[PDB]
Design a protein around this ligand. Structure first.
Ligand SMILES: [Co+2]
Ligand SMILES: [Co+2]
Lengths: 470, 470
């Protein structure tokens, strides 16, 4: 049997994406493939399970789908464990995004625009939680330790955030076989589209850290293609407009970073700029166009409300499936239940590469081990790799990242990772304080104490408060 | 002949200290030792020369003292070149400290308390100048390149600030035989005095970067002595009072850093804390006692005025020597012209070790070359070394610096060095801007542009403005 366990399968849309991809991958769509859907939130989990089962029936896939509320049962003997859990306490919240929103509001109350978790080169919303990401870190480490005992040959595929911090901590502190996953590299394809380049004719590479990746190689017809970006900047950037709040790859911010660093930041890296692009909403609109991007006080709550409505509709759709077994999810909701189209995401290609030797190029968070020679061997980087049944094989990164990327961007972000890990493992509030002492928004030490006090005293943070109790 | 050249010998008191030490070192107080005193400021230089010559006469030393206004003449065939020059333009200023004071005032005008050169872990006054330290860097590099051609066997002994940045840049960019000098390590002896320990019974070591050194080993009677510091903190810190504005080694700030980092910061490292200790004068007085330390808007101008008065008195004393050849400088001014007492500083012990094999332990700024294994080989560190005629021999640093010192202190300060070097060599104002974009005192990008504009437009910064002209 091939056991693929989705931890946090109450994240309905992602669970359905994974199931859909497995059921449309020939080498994996087999009777001996068992997909375990695990979560502690029964209403969400039941909905995901109902829709997943009806979905594979319509795809005429023979995969087995099992629902469980037991973490141990999901881990036991698993071949791949996909951690997409974003924990939350249903006594207070209906989503992990809600606990992030509420602590962010407390930060803003104390003078930290977009919350204390928003930091230079670290603006992506919902990425860390009170700096050290205690609930998310704790759960990943618990999974890793169970997996070492109950599934020693499994891969832990970490998708819940912070991918950088969690993958680092699990690797360093447990030695468990964890790999971090993020689709941010997909930004390159919009660069190629806006420059009118056939992507198949582009020789390209990216590298960096999660949400901190750079287009280090960009070549076309045997020449550097960056002069083509220079021409686009001069002729077309003035007319650029975001299609939606997430659209930033060709934004003024991205091009300002390219001018300074010498390479274009890719994907969510564009969100992770210095404070120059993020002082306030008006500044974000200058640098990202009319929406101000997605990491602001208007668009981020709006988006989280869209998610809530979307998941409630999926839960209702599951009730409809139970009442009308004759309906076709693939006909009435093709966007959610596609047939004959893979998602394009990396998770199931990874599984098919490891398990069935379908070799593929992916961008994964793995230990550097000398790929970027100026950084420590054990620091987790987002790197171009080839994956097959013999494991993960790092590409040579050529051209090297620029001097400015290293000293002004990667090293500061790597140090922040180390600060955050130290804040977690030390259980020492003084480390959280020191992080905010390096925060440009801090005006006084008393401000730091008070904002942390109020965050810790939120009712849903009792375990966190006790964790850090001096 | 043994040629020791003091570049910036118009720094009268330091020049006299060097001369006094040479003339009281048996292996160096010889007819074949020639001390060249060089500077471009004739009134200062003439005074230093007059007093130096009268001084060695009273010490009955046979050393030869030569005065020159020619840099090439001073460098030509030198064995040791001591760069203590702090350049300034006499059309505007009477000291290098004055150009620093005036740019600092402009910074404060634009909302940067204690000037843009004051940064986290980098509060020491007059250490950098408009971040990249253009005039000071430029002069050191000019000396290094002349020395490679005209004195290929010489040591360049860098004492002018920034010692870290300049020593790094000269080593990396010219490969010249430069070594950086600073006496900050002397703070350890006040620790031993306040804990009632015979210094000769203490087994100790420090290491770090310039003004960023830590008491990594502190042992007494075969045990860790840090518990003795813990007892002093509990019983005696509440009654601690600074003797003068420079007195900070046992201050609340120093002990707060010890509590966080696990080792005591030594010397000027105590001045180089986070912004926690430096938001404003009242905060500095909380953490450093009644003066607020030396790096504030009251004590630093007061001290620079004391320096001006002191140097004017020395210039007048030189006129008095010329009029009254019969007076004894050693009798009427023993503090300035000591006899039978070495200064305790490292410069002349270094020379006697290299030249005459009088081996000695010193703390010098030299390339890491694996001494602190987590940092690059070529980064200049302030390290414990033994010096003899075979050169500089790094001690093993044991215990290693703590994890927190590395990730929260040394790496950020090293990155700042790299930022500053990049700002210099790139000639790119955008790098200076990026440095201020990482500055907690920055409220907006427009503020950065305006403060840099006004600094560049000061009349005495014309060469600097043209250097950075886009
Ligand atoms: Co991501
Ligand atoms: Co110094």
């Amino acid at each position: 049997h091939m056991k693929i366990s989705i931890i946090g399968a109450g994240s309905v849309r992602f669970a359905l994406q994974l199931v859909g991809d497995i059921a449309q991958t020939e080498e994996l769509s087999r009777e001996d493939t068992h997909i375990y859907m695990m979560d502690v939130h029964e209403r969400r989990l039941n909905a995901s399970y109902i829709l997943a089962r009806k979905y594979v029936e319509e795809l005429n896939s023979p995969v087995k789908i099992v629902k469980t509320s037991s973490l141990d049962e999901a881990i036991d003997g698993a071949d791949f464990i996909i951690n997409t859990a974003y924990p939350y306490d249903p006594r207070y919240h209906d989503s992990g995004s809600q606990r992030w929103d509420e602590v962010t509001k407390v930060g803003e109350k104390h003078g930290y625009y977009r919350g204390i978790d928003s930091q230079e080169l670290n603006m992506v919303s919902t990425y860390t939680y009170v700096l050290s990401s205690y609930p998310d870190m704790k759960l990943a480490l618990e999974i890793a330790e169970k997996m070492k005992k109950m599934a020693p040959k499994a891969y832990l595929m970490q998708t819940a955030n912070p991918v950088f911090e969690i993958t680092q901590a699990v690797r360093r502190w447990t030695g468990a076989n964890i790999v971090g996953f993020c689709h941010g590299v997909a930004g390159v394809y919009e660069v190629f589209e806006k420059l009118d380049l056939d992507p198949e004719e582009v020789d390209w590479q990216v590298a960096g850290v999660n949400h901190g990746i750079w287009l280090n190689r960009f070549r076309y017809r045997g020449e550097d293609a960056y002069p083509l970006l220079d021409e686009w900047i001069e002729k077309k950037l003035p007319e650029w407009e975001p299609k939606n709040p997430w659209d930033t790859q060709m934004s003024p911010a991205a091009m300002d970073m390219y001018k300074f660093y010498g390479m274009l930041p890719i994907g969510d890296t564009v969100r992770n700029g210095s404070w120059k692009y993020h002082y306030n909403l008006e500044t974000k609109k200058k640098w990202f166009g009319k929406f101000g991007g997605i990491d602001n006080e208007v668009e981020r709550p709006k988006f989280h409300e869209q998610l809530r409505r979307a998941r409630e509709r999926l839960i209702k759709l599951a009730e409809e499936v139970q009442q009308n077994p004759g309906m076709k999810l693939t006909e009435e909701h093709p966007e959610i239940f596609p047939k004959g189209k893979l998602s394009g995401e990396q998770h199931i290609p990874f599984i098919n590469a490891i398990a069935n030797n379908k070799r593929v190029r992916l961008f994964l968070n793995v230990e550097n081990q000398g790929t970027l020679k100026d950084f420590p061997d054990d620091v987790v980087m987002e790197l171009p790799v080839w994956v097959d049944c013999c494991g993960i094989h790092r590409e040579k990164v050529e051209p090297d990242l620029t001097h400015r990327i290293k000293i002004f961007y990667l090293w500061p972000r790597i140090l922040r990772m180390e600060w955050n890990l130290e804040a977690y493992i030390s259980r020492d509030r003084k480390v959280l304080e020191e992080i905010l002492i390096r925060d440009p928004r801090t005006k006084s030490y008393e401000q730091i104490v008070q904002v942390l006090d109020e965050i810790f005293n939120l009712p849903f943070n009792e375990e966190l408060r006790r964790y850090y109790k001096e």
